[PDB]
Specification:
SH3 domain; signaling protein; protein; CD2-associated protein; SH3 type barrels; 60 residues; monomeric
């Protein structure tokens, strides 16, 4: 319930696990809610995953 806004991918993230969402630079990820500070939960097109809020900013 943070009224979270979509975060655009600014930096490259090569995931350590496939549970980690592949951050493609330039695209935007629709986040549901953040679960553990760094690790947010959202889906990029058809893959749902966890992504670190370091490489993505809620600037939109």
């Amino acid at each position: 319930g943070s009224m979270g806004r979509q975060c655009k991918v600014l930096f490259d993230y090569s995931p350590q696990n496939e549970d980690e969402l592949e951050l493609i630079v330039g695209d935007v990820i629709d986040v549901i809610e953040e679960v553990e500070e760094g690790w947010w939960s959202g889906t990029l097109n058809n893959k749902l995953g966890l992504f670190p809020s370091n490489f993505v900013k809620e600037l939109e």
